[PDB]
Symmetry: C3
Subunit: 496 residues, 3 copies
């Protein structure tokens, strides 16, 4: 019935890097074509960009977007997507059994990214390509002019270099489904050598080495150790990927999965510091969580599409329609990312448009709308800039089918000194009981209580209406904040 | 004197996969240039192909043909053999120290294969190239259209895809002679990854991983075990390569070497069976014997030309001239191949034209004639479709100088249900003593007893007419259920039933 | 005070191979641009080559020049430096943080080598490139005509192939500063396979496998043992690099570092002989000492240029101005090389022009002059062709700050049977006392005694004139030669 946590600006975890509110666009399904890019459409500007989609993206305040993959990158040749569009080829995309027309490449996406106030985090091909191709691409993007590839950029219409800050050394080459799959030694060596080379061209960039595809890989976490062992001195991040599903329809146990996310993260941190010791390095590797989401709804329609319909352009792949319970887990995951903001400095909601996304457009030019998961993300990114405090919290527990001793309440406070606000992100994953949260704020006035609630866990949004949306509802006296947390609710409580 | 074996239609081994009667053209010596392809000559059609040669290949009923190598492929760049011929470059072929003009390539050789009723089994360059190059070549050949490398094929004269069904992941890279030689681990990994990628482009293809260059390689059979442990889930075949020679001038020993062939095959099957258990797989790896033949005659002259006359176009390399004893071993090898039809599904006589070949054209315009070895391969290919039946044979035995307990008679029956025939292939490796074969056939009339005999083991053929050729002879005779055939000492025998 | 040494033509070491008087030119600094190559300068020919430079090179009688690297080659694309000069790209050089314009490449350098009476020793990129690309270049250079790359060379304006005799299999890839850094196994495999392929195009070439970058690399000499274990049957040499410096300002210790060189050579020989036994080969590997010099003076200045001032064309890197003590050590090194002429068959003074060089041109059209180190090399190269005689020598010893039992006199005799002369090379590493050399010659008239001496060990040369030049000074009888060797001096004593 009652949950208690104390909140104190003295007891810090770290400052939030806004890059943990990043996302990701891959050349996959309708992410780009019949998605962000629809040339002759009434809602499309000059570049063919859906204006209504741009607006929705600015709503989430996404500062950084991974691109262009994803499995797609492991067999992509970046030259195919630049220069005169007339001379760009159509390629088989082996990852997703599609045809890539390459009408959107590095320059097109680059300008899309300005329009939504983001910048690229670039992936390079290390599956079928290597060191020299990574160098060409880096030079093309970051070198100012008067060398072969910088002049090639300039000639292609882009006078100023994109100056891309963060680059990813390939993509998840641990899996048997990946083109150019590598062993940990193989990938370790190619990543170390690519990183060494790229740093000679531009010392100011940052580099992400690939972690395991998931914690469930037999090579997790030795992959990470081995890869960091080779590449430590030349790279700045290790990558982490996690996705969750409710195919077993067990909402209580589903909502408990952020606890495993916490465990996953710690394991990866521990693996980092192990190698840190090994190298007697003073540098900390930070975590890049460059693929996280809920993902299960559309697995079967994806199966029908390959084969039976291979080599289509822009097939409707990975189009999960999200529920209310899904949006709760997303909220729980953001909360977990925040509690680890000392080590996690980049995270990417996978993905941004149509493909497991919080922003859908209909098909053949449809209207565009917010999925359920759009909202806990919007709150996180908007009120979540500042300083994370340690969640000292005693809260009721419960068991689920496959998880023991799971907290009913999961919460984090983040303090914004420059605004004199303290936002409490809180989720009641007790699916049945309501709970009152008593918050001894060793402060330092209440500003609002924003809530995401619904009686139907399986309810969805659609092109027709929103159902799940932030309601400014509810319900603080001395320096004690007391707030009722509805069973199965996402809460965002502010102070002034 | 007495040979007893017993046919039985109910006692089967396997259905013959017609791809055990495949062959192989490498861009080597006179195989293509001044061989199957002579653009000026009077016997050559509108494309430039010797039609006499085309007619001879058809005689052999060769369903499948390896191309373009062989050692040649390890440093080949396929793009050089396609597009406008005026814009194709000439290349050093390191394999054979020769200049490759590339006037024949892929699209040209795929036309040739249509005309001989054959398909291409394509090798890819894995010596100095890798995954993405294998990917482009597959897309160019097998993808219908609407993408860079398919649209490219179309632009080059070929509207429909070749849809090539079997691919070889590189060529024999364990050897210190091979350009881009790999260790078993390097090859295993490149083979696994190349196969993984290709199957994403076209799931209908089948793939062959390279075995050892020979059973005599010190890394055999660990090579095979290792390469399969890597690529098991993405490949369908492992290769075997075997050649024999009679430099010792011992004929009875020479014909006995098909026992060594049997052992080689069983070893590879045991190796596959072991990895299968290791992987707990329900799949059996099958055997592609994509290089076999007798080879030895031209060894001296072959070295002479490299390197004392290097970088010629189409030098006369590997032009073994075949004798009659060679033809018996080739016949025995085919029998051994057939006997293992339950695991060997592809096999290639190496090679088809000029180069250790059954077919020859002379030089600078040729003439075209059949070598001794042409004939057993012809019979095998023609009457050897259907079901191999289990050979229960009690044969007299005989030692030789380097082998023990070698059967005098080596025999196999193949039953075609669609014709209600039952062909019986037998070789009498008893070089001295004629022997009769008592065939108790639980059938089931007699149709013929084609034979291959000559009194001179060292006798050859030439452009000036045969010498060794099939004679519709014997001395056969079939009563109720029993066939009793006299098998002349040192003979090949094709005995049919109606 | 007393030093003796016996000299017996029956007691030989080896015939000297002129290729130990080789040198090296890298696309580094002003070595080429504003060095050997200066297009429309009054001192240059039609082709753009500085004629006075050309003459100075000839004075050193250099039979062989390594080209074009050096760290530079490891990310060099040879096709960039050939064909129509208007169509050659400008490339980033990652090794030296410079822009390489590629006006000079292969064909231009092949004809400069003619004018200086020298053959090229060609290095191939084995950093970002591999087997096929090394084949192409060899075909381009050595195959007469009738193939893609041979014909290409003919089209570019060179009808007869350069027919390059020696090739280096990459450069220094054992070091973390090199683009395309390889492990000893990675490199062993790649050198082996590249060697195998190249020898199929041209069996008459010789190949050098890369040894360790220096004897202080943690992987020396295991790198040598390993690489040779792979590539023995296809290569002819193992490379050695060594460079000495005097930042300690310890002129006596510094002059003893030719003893660490001697020890370095011996270890590389032992390693070769080890693998030889392992292979049961009847072939010996020879040593190619393709980088040796003094190098330390310009270290701080080099750092200042890269970075905070990078991507310049022809920046003034590695421009050491050599002292007199510096000249003494070169002579010491030469003598040490000479003592090992039975296994060392190629050595390259690094480098020829401007870059840690004996030959300098001023800057922007400059002037051209000789450094101190020019002369010991010049003498060694001129009077050093013949047959090396075992140094049977009893010399006073001295200890130094870091070297015990250093010889006071280092010396060798070489006997040119054709000219009926016997040259003795000698250094007095004892910078204080003047020693006398009683040279028993089981001969067999004294021709001259050349000397290189100076009162100030730190004196330099400069464009304004030479403070250090050979003086025909000094100071024989029965068959016993006696000469006084001034403290801290280079001596060339001759006989007819």
């Amino acid at each position: 019935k009652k949950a208690r946590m104390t909140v104190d600006k003295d007891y810090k975890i770290a400052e939030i890097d806004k890059r943990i509110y990043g996302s990701f666009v891959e050349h996959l399904g309708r992410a780009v074509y019949d998605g962000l890019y629809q040339p002759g459409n009434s809602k499309s500007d000059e570049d063919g960009f859906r204006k209504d989609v741009i607006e929705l993206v600015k709503e989430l305040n996404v500062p950084i977007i991974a691109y262009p993959g994803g499995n797609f990158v492991s067999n992509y040749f970046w030259e195919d997507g630049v220069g005169p569009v007339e001379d760009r080829p159509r390629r088989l995309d082996l990852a997703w059994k599609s045809i890539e027309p390459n009408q959107v490449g590095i320059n097109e996406f680059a300008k899309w990214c300005k329009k939504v106030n983001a910048e690229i985090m670039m992936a390079v091909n290390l599956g079928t390509r290597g060191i020299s191709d990574a160098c060409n691409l880096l030079e093309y993007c970051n070198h100012p002019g008067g060398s072969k590839y910088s002049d090639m950029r300039i000639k292609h219409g882009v006078k100023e270099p994109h100056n891309i800050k963060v680059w990813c050394l390939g993509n998840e080459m641990d899996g048997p489904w990946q083109v150019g799959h590598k062993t940990m030694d193989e990938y370790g060596r190619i990543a170390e050598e690519t990183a060494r080379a790229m740093k000679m061209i531009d010392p100011s960039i940052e580099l992400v080495a690939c972690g395991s595809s998931s914690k469930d890989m037999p090579t997790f976490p030795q992959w990470e150790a081995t890869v960091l062992d080779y590449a430590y001195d030349y790279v700045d991040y290790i990558s982490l990927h996690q996705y969750y599903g409710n195919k077993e329809n067990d909402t209580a146990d589903f909502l408990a999965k952020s606890d495993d996310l916490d465990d996953f993260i710690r394991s990866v941190i521990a693996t980092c510091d192990y190698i840190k010791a090994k190298k007697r390095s003073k540098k900390d590797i930070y975590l890049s969580f460059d693929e996280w989401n809920v993902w299960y709804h559309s697995n079967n329609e994806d199966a029908n599409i390959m084969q039976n319909e291979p080599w289509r352009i822009a097939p409707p792949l990975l189009e999960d329609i999200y529920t209310f319970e899904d949006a709760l887990l997303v909220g729980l995951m953001l909360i977990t990312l925040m509690k680890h903001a000392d080590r996690i400095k980049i995270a990417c909601l996978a993905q941004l448009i149509n493909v497991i996304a919080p922003i859908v457009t209909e098909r053949n030019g449809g209207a565009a709308w917010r999925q359920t998961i759009f909202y806990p993300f919007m709150h996180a990114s908007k009120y979540g800039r500042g300083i994370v405090l340690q969640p000292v919290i005693n809260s009721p527990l419960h068991d689920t089918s496959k998880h023991e001793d799971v907290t009913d309440i999961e919460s984090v406070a983040i303090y914004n000194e420059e605004k004199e606000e303290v936002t409490i992100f809180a989720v009641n994953r007790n699916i049945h009981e309501d709970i009152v949260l008593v918050s001894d704020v060793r402060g330092m006035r209440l500003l609002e209580h924003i809530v995401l609630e619904h009686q139907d866990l399986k309810i969805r949004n659609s092109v027709n209406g929103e159902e799940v949306y932030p309601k400014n509802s509810d319900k603080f006296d001395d320096g004690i904040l007391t707030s009722m947390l509805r069973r199965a609710s996402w809460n965002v409580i502010r102070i002034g």
